[PDB]
């Protein structure tokens, strides 16, 4: 089964199992491999990974990590997946004194939207996305990767799993607890990496849900019906909440140019109805000179 | 706006019609079958219906379970004493792959009667997998139906409960059904319900959607509209029961009927 991989040194691990960088022995070809302990007596195979394989089987695109196999036992899964070099949270920890330059940051958020645009254009949500979630290889590629939390979605949707999306990168319609999230909630997550790529700082950083509301509302104003038809509607929100007022994105993303700071509002905008999409986020000024720089390795 | 996906819809719908062509079960499958009949399929999608029901699981999950045993039977000759295996745990891989909140494998044990025992479900859970080579995102006649339901003005709560049954009762007869795609059955449910409810015809905007006219939904009209006449004298009634209930308003109370006027 895996007597043609040789382990070479763990990546990181999680919740049903680790993941280890290997070899093809036979061909060279160097991959990540998950392995995925069944629960054969119990609750068989978690439903986390029959998500992540039936919906990365389906979804074939360069900003998409691409499942390589699933190889079987009556025991173990293993997935085998293409390595890339490292996770985009250790790479802006390394960047965190030399910056990260704009045109890689313009190429990086590009192609993510390029990946994004694919998943909802193929009806999955990814519902993690995150620094850690994203890898880059030394080419100046960048990919969408951790399907786990993801979810094949109807139209219109129906009400999905709350528990979705870490903290930080959580859209405010799923803090207020809407019956009903869609690709909105990707999208947010994306402005929140925009703004952290740029920044090598993450943009809302709550030790808490109620904290995590208070830390957006200061940095885009405190909403009202005139800003989001509805949020005062919704629950879990508050009469209560302070009145915050929109600083300037020239103070929240200093390095950002004009275009920048415009992609980055309409990506944060409150009301899930008129945040941008990633089609049309591709379309954006921003990426009229959109280049793809190799990053410093 | 944007829970009904304005810049995806119609990328999402293109993409279904070419999925649910590779998920699309063998029309002829039955008589290769040996020990297993229509007969039997349908007294076991009925049951899924009933555990759909004891368990409060979305419709969606029923027609995936459906979709996943067909698949299986289109590929793997099963014995009758195990086909009830197959379909608990097709319900069981529908439930994880669509349920915020699947039961547990021991509620699927339970359901069986103890004909099986968990380490037979567990097991045929992994086999249903390999044969399936994890393929779990099939279209269903729900994902078009949902889609179909957009284009009405204004949204009629008796419509969308009418084409719902109408589209759970093809699932129980393999034949003729399984010679329709979901897209072309969920077109019919739909016509078929909008016309018995409100008078009015598959909409234009949807001719325009689906390339489908009522010219090329005829055949499977024609089925549907005879297996909704006939609906009451099936020999499985789950689906009926299900649908006189408050929560779908009564429709498999409405009288079908009697000429589709084509
Ligand atoms: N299982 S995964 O999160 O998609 C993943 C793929 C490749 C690497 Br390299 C690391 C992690
Ligand atoms: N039929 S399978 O062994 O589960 C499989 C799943 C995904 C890939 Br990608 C390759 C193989």
């Known amino acids: 089964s895996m007597e043609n991989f040789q382990k070479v040194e763990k990546i990181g691990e999680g919740t049903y199992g680790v993941v280890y960088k290997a070899r093809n022995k036979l061909t060279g070809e160097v991959v990540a491999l998950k392995k995925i302990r069944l629960d054969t007596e119990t609750e068989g195979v978690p439903s986390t990974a029959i998500r992540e394989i039936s919906l990365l089987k389906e979804l074939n695109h360069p900003n998409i ?39 890689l940051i313009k190429s990086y958020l590009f192609q993510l939207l390029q990946g994004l645009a694919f998943c909802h254009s193929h009806r999955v949500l990814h519902r993690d996305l995150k620094p850690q979630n994203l890898l880059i290889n030394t080419e100046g590629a960048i990919k969408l990767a951790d399907f786990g939390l993801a979810r094949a979605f109807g139209v219109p949707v129906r009400t999905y799993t709350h528990e979705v999306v870490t903290l930080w990168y959580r859209a405010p319609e799923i803090l207020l607890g809407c019956k009903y999230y869609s690709t909105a909630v990707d999208i947010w997550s994306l402005g929140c990496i ?104 | 706006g944007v829970n009904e996906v304005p810049d ?42 009933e555990v759909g029901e004891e368990y409060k699981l979305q419709n969606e999950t029923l027609h995936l379970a459906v979709n996943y ?25 529908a439930s994880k792959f669509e349920e915020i909140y699947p039961p ?89 319900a909008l016309y018995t409810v409100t008078g009015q015809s598959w909409p234009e905007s949807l001719v325009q959607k689906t390339g489908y006219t009522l010219e090329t939904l005829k055949p499977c009209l024609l089925d549907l509209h005879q297996t909704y006449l006939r609906a009451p004298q099936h020999a499985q009634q789950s689906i009926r029961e299900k649908y006189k209930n408050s929560k779908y308003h009564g429709v498999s109370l409405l009288n079908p009927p009697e000429t589709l006027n084509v």
């Open chain 2, 8 to 49: 995806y819809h119609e990328d999402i719908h293109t993409y279904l019609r070419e999925m649910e062509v590779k998920c699309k079960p063998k029309v002829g499958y039955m008589k290769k079958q040996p020990d297993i009949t229509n007969s039997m399929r349908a007294i076991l999608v009925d049951w899924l219906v």
């Open chain 1, 194 to 297: 925009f703004a952290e790529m740029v920044t090598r700082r993450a943009l809302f950083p709550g030790d808490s849900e109620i904290d995590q509301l208070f830390r957006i509302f200061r940095t885009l104003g405190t909403p009202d019906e005139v800003v989001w038809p509805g949020v005062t509607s919704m629950p879990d929100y508050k009469p209560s909440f302070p009145k915050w007022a929109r600083q300037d994105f020239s103070k929240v993303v200093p390095p950002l140019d004009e275009d920048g700071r415009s992609l980055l509002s309409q990506m944060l905008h409150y009301d899930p109805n008129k945040r941008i999409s990633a089609k049309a986020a591709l379309a954006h000024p921003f990426f009229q000179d959109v280049t793809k720089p190799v990053p410093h390795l």
């Open chain 1, 65 to 103: 990590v691409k499942l390589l196999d699933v190889i079987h036992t009556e025991n173990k899964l293993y997935l085998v997946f293409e390595f890339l070099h490292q996770d985009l949270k250790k790479f802006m920890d390394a960047s965190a004194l030399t910056g990260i330059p704009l045109p």
């Open chain 2, 104 to 192: 547990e494998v021991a509620e699927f044990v339970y359901i069986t009667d103890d004909t099986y025992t968990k380490k037979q479900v567990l097991r045929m859970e992994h086999l249903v997998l390999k044969v399936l080579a994890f393929d779990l995102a099939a279209p269903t006649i729900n994902q078009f139906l949902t889609q179909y339901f957009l284009h009405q003005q204004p949204a009629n709560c008796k419509v969308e409960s009418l084409a719902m049954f109408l589209g759970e009762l093809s699932l129980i007869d393999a034949d003729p059904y399984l010679k329709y795609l979901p897209s072309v059955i969920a077109a019919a449910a739909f016509h078929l």
């Open chain 2, 69 to 93: 045993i067909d698949r299986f039977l289109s590929s793997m000759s099963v014995l009758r004493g195990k086909l009830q295996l197959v379909g608990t745990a097709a319900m069981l891989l």
